């Protein structure tokens, strides 16, 4: 006698092998298409007419160099639907126009929403706190700023990161040469977050494993544990005294330690996301003007910053001709900045 | 090396969020949840079975560590092994 | 005397020196001193107010 | 400043020599040295 | 009278002071070079 919502809710939230839930209605369709779009694009779809490159296994690329490349810059920020004014219903021409990138980017962005809603959905059902969903906001902020916000501030989707291994590497090296992204204080906070989180993961895992209580007679200490055991498996007091005498400071609160393990990585990605938002507008921390004034006036003042500035000039000049074919940059070799010999 | 630090950052966030999500109620809302833990406690401050249940439904039951000892070894091994190889990478590239 | 005024400048340099060869860097914002001072003291005072309040109870 | 490349072109890396915290650095040993051991007592002067 | 029943007392332990002081100073160290530019 239950209504549609109740009868459907019963089926969606059934405790099966792979939980579906209400958010699965949004996650699984979009996530499958984003996965399928990437695998299809890296296997058969070319980037010959968008970037002048081969980016599929069928064209001869391998896992490292295959990618689902962005549309041509002339497309601007066109959403590039299968039915849009570009590639009007023609599937094969849609693939040749780079429309598969916006397909993966859009259905992929809604999959991230669906997965984060899934974390809320399951946590409410299991009756626990929603801190895993809050932790997942950081990867979403990275995806939203890097794959959506940054190209939207630039000329078009062409400058978004293409979905591939080497394509991401080109995107990375583009940011050094054109944005000096290493010098940005927001990637610096992002690096500290990621490196700090990797440190915490390793240091906490090792500390627990080396302060374990003897709860068995076997050398294999993995078996001497029960998920329902009330006693702690490792000595926090020994762990605390160890790091107090080795490092000078140690965690004394188990709850604080695990929250810190969550705060460092999330805060890092969020800070890094702010910096990429700034690069979307070319609002970059490219240079220190005081040193540039000093260097120009004094031809003997050199720092590692000025050396990097010259490296960026080399990256921009030797990469623009092929990385930006829409600009039609024909640079004669004499005009390219080149050092002695080499 | 990148998988070591991206994965280590992922595992740190997941382990931290999963333990925080499973804190056993021992305080009020006008106090920090950290106050619920007393240094030297002989009992567990969070429910491991509850956290495993959440992550079990999140992907599937057998993709989650039911064992805290196995979980913490994995938390240590993954970044350490990854950094070992990227350290070797620079060392190998030292000899061109 | 303007000939002798510029004679010393082209000759042995003037006084007050500078850190190292050159560290004037007048392009430096100088307002960054106030920005750095205010960003340090204001949050530091906020934290010290709460700690001393807490430590006394 | 330190002549890192061995080409008699010193590179400033100190705060008192015009660098900030981001651009300041301890410059590596000169390329003329190579891998040779260079303790302070193997130099004629501390300026060298 | 009728004192407000929503009164609470803010608390900050010493370890939070050190974390806060480290954050304020390390953030200034990071950003000072850019503000001075």
């Amino acid at each position: 006698k239950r209504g549609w919502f109740d009868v459907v809710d019963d089926w969606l939230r059934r405790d099966r092998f792979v939980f579906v839930g209400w958010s699965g209605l949004l996650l699984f369709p979009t996530a499958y298409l984003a996965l399928g779009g990437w695998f299809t694009g890296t296997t058969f779809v070319t980037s010959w007419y968008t970037h002048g490159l081969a980016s599929s296994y069928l064209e001869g690329c391998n896992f490292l160099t295959a990618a689902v490349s962005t549309p041509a810059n002339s497309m601007g920020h066109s959403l590039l639907f299968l039915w849009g004014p570009e590639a009007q219903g023609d599937f094969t021409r849609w693939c040749q126009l780079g429309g598969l990138w916006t397909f993966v980017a859009l259905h992929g962005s809604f999959s991230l929403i669906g997965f984060m809603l899934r974390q809320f959905e399951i946590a409410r059902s299991v009756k626990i706190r929603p801190y895993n969903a809050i932790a997942f906001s950081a990867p979403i902020s990275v995806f939203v700023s890097v794959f959506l916000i940054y190209p939207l501030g630039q000329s078009g989707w062409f400058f978004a990161p293409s979905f591939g291994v080497a394509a991401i590497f080109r995107f990375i090296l583009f940011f050094q040469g054109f944005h000096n992204w290493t010098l940005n204080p927001f990637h610096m906070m992002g690096v500290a977050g990621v490196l700090g989180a990797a440190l915490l993961c390793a240091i906490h895992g090792a500390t627990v494993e080396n302060t374990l209580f003897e709860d068995g007679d076997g050398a294999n200490t993995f078996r001497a544990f029960n998920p329902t055991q009330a006693e702690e498996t490792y000595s926090m007091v020994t762990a605390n005294r160890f790091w107090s005498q080795i490092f000078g400071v140690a965690f004394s609160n188990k709850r604080w330690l695990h929250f810190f393990m969550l705060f460092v990585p999330v805060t890092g990605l969020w800070m890094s996301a702010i910096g990429v938002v700034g690069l979307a507008l070319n609002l970059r921390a490219y240079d220190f003007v005081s040193q540039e004034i000093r260097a120009a006036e004094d031809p003997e003042f050199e720092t590692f910053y000025t050396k990097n500035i010259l490296l960026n000039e080399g990256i921009r000049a030797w990469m623009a001709a092929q990385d930006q074919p829409h600009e039609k940059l024909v640079f004669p070799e004499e005009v390219l900045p080149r050092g002695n010999a080499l | 090396g990148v998988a070591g630090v991206f994965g280590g950052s992922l595992f740190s966030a997941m382990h931290g969020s999963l333990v925080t999500s499973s804190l056993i109620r021992e305080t009020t809302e006008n106090e920090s949840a950290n106050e619920g833990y007393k240094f030297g406690q002989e009992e567990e401050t969070y429910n491991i079975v509850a956290a495993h249940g959440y992550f079990g439904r999140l992907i599937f039951q057998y993709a989650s560590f039911n064992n805290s000892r196995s979980l913490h070894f994995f938390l240590a091994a993954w970044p350490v092994v990854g950094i070992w190889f990227t350290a070797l990478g620079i060392s190998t590239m030292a000899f061109n | 005397x303007x000939x002798x005024x510029x004679x010393x400048x082209x000759x042995x340099x003037x006084x007050x020196x500078x850190x190292x060869x050159x560290x004037x860097x007048m392009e430096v914002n100088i307002l960054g001193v106030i920005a750095t001072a205010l960003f340090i003291i204001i949050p530091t005072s906020f934290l010290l107010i709460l700690y001393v309040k807490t430590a006394s109870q | 400043p330190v002549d890192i490349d061995g080409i008699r072109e010193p590179v400033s890396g100190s705060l008192l020599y015009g660098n900030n915290i981001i651009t300041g650095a301890i410059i590596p040993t000169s390329n003329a040295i190579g891998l040779h051991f260079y303790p302070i007592w193997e130099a004629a002067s501390l300026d060298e | 009278a009728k004192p407000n029943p929503n009164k609470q007392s803010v608390e900050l332990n010493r370890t939070s002071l050190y974390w806060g002081l480290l954050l304020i100073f390390v953030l200034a160290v990071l950003f000072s070079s850019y503000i001075f530019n």
């Binding site: 107090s244 400071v249 | - | 430096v28 340090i40 | - | -």
Partner: peptide, 30 residues
Amino acid sequence: MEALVYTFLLVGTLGIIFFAIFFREPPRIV
């Protein structure tokens, strides 16, 4: 003047590190 600010910031951070290690709240068992 920037060199003064940079040096003060750095030695100030090391001052906090020194106090956090030796002038810390001791972890007392329950």
